[PDB]
Amino acid sequence: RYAVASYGPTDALTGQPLDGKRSHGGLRLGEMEHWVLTAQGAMQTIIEKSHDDSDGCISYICRNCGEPAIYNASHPIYKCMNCDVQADIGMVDSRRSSIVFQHEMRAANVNITSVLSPRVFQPA
């Protein structure tokens, strides 16, 4: 038997709980669990478990160049080291292991550019 917590030891790389009862970490909602939850349409449960309980975080992407931006509400930093004067930063909901995945792709000399969903406005 095992029940842990809303908190505990996490992995330094992925930011996710450690594996199993031995590490005093969490339990895995694996690939097949997400298939079942998607088949049920339960997307708020996926956000609760895969994002709020595993490693969900905030990512900042500059609108004009699609590259990761640097934002900090306290100690105000609103900057982007690709245009540096036209920065238009939006916050997108992500996971740490996904940002690690994108940094690893760029480490292999593959440029990852995120095209944000465009603004939409009522007519006139």
Min dist. Cβ of residue 23 to other proteins (A): 10
Token pair, residue 25, equals: 């970490």
Cβ proximity of 75 and 54 under 8 Å: no
Q: How many residues does the chain have?
A: 124
Which of other proteins, Zn ion, none has residue 61 at its interface (CB below 5 to 8 Å by kind)?
other proteins
Task: Enumerate the β-bridge partners of residue 92.
Answer: 59
Interaction of residue 61 with Zn ion, rule CB under 5 A:
no
Which parts of 13-42 interact with other proteins (CB under 8 A)? 13-19, 24-42
Which parts of 57-96 interact with other proteins (CB under 8 A)? 57-61, 63-73, 75-79, 81-82, 85-96
> Which of residues 56 and 60 has its CB atom nearest to Zn ion in the complex?
60
> Where does residue 30 fall: left (phi above 0), alpha (psi -120 to 50 degrees), or beta otherwise?
beta
> Where does residue 50 fall: left (phi above 0), alpha (psi -120 to 50 degrees), or beta otherwise?
alpha
Q: According to CB under 5 A, which one of 26, 54, 62, 94 is a site residue for Zn ion? A: 62
